[PDB]
Amino acid sequence: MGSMERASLIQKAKLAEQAERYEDMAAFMKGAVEKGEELSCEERNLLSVAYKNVVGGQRAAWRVLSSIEQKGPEVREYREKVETELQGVCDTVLGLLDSHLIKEAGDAESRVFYLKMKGDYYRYLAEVATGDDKKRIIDSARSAYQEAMDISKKEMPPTNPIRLGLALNFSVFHYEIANSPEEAISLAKTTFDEAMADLHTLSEDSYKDSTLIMQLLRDNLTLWT
Template sequence: MGDREESVYQAKLAEQAERYDEMVESMKKVAGMEVELTVEERNLLSVAYKNVIGARRASWRIISSIEQKEESKGGEDKLKMIREYRQTVENELKSICNDILDVLEKYLIPASTSGESKVFYYKMKGDYHRYLAEFATGNDRKEAAENSLVAYKAASDIAMMELPPTHPIRLGLALNFSVFYYEILNSPDRACRLAKAAFDDAIAELDTLSEESYKDSTLIMQLLRDNLTLWTSDMQGDGEEQTKEALQDVEDENP
């Protein structure tokens, strides 16, 4: 077994054992070989980082919610502890995001040749800058939001040219880009327009949907529709439900 195959197998073992930090390290080794990743390798890398960042994003939301409740009570001693703890989680989030953004910039984007892989990586770049924007403030938030917007736009330009409207990666991009407009730029109208256009374009070409991507594509279309329903009711002044995004970058149906 060569170095590449060994690292991929280690990543699969780590995934089965739910040891995602080690899964990240194994896939970083593969990315650092400066080769174009296969679809399987690309998805392993995506799943690894998504789990590592997902756990911290969930922690941050919980701690922030506790902080808000404590602020309304005015408990200064507890607030100091909560804020320090939140800062610890934010430092971890920052470190993980900067890590994958560095890997994307140095290795993955330069090595990608197909339209599909370019869209996948630019979308990923947009996602991780968006995660930075979720907790950043002031100029840091502004910079993260701008970087996210540029990456999502680059992904969209390529997707419009090279991927059909029913392609799961194009749909996943539209889903996450619309969440970015809604949550980061506070622009529900643009979020709704983007999500609706992606949904309508896919519906119009449903007959072109390939059998292998049918499940992924229809799931994301459902999420787009769910968000549209939620955002529309939110704009009319009710509903505080959680917005849905692609929880895993599409095509990660690993055996």
């Protein structure tokens, strides 16, 4: 995408989302990041939407194949093929975050957003990991989420939607990856309750966003308890 203007890449990412062409969307956003400039709030959301959809589809396919495999070499080979492609996308996202989105992000909102992404893509790698590096992959996710949590608690109100989504995802990490369901439940409960107590400060539109994510926290708590 090196020959396309930054603004054209952003425009085409928005078109690709409307057309449900998420692989294209991700390629346009990778090209935009590689222009070397920081991303605005809207642009960070385009980047996240694109890769979350791509990897989300790979994860769903890997789960179908892994279930068939658990129940000739073809099933294992094909699961391995999908797994390698998933790992490749996660590595690409982590590479964008490391070169150089995180290091240039100084405002709390941008830095937390990117560290939450970093935790998420290490979490997706952990979902498929089995080898000598599995513990290290899990700890890489934990470390990214933890740094994001520490910044969010110092710099953002308890209803901030990035802070809430981070806590949601870190709670999923605890439950599904780290084998720490009590930590997951405690984080989700404390996050929900501290957000509830700050809703009175919000406008109607901020209220809607915070309560939307609070409902996701509650949905998980209902599933886990």
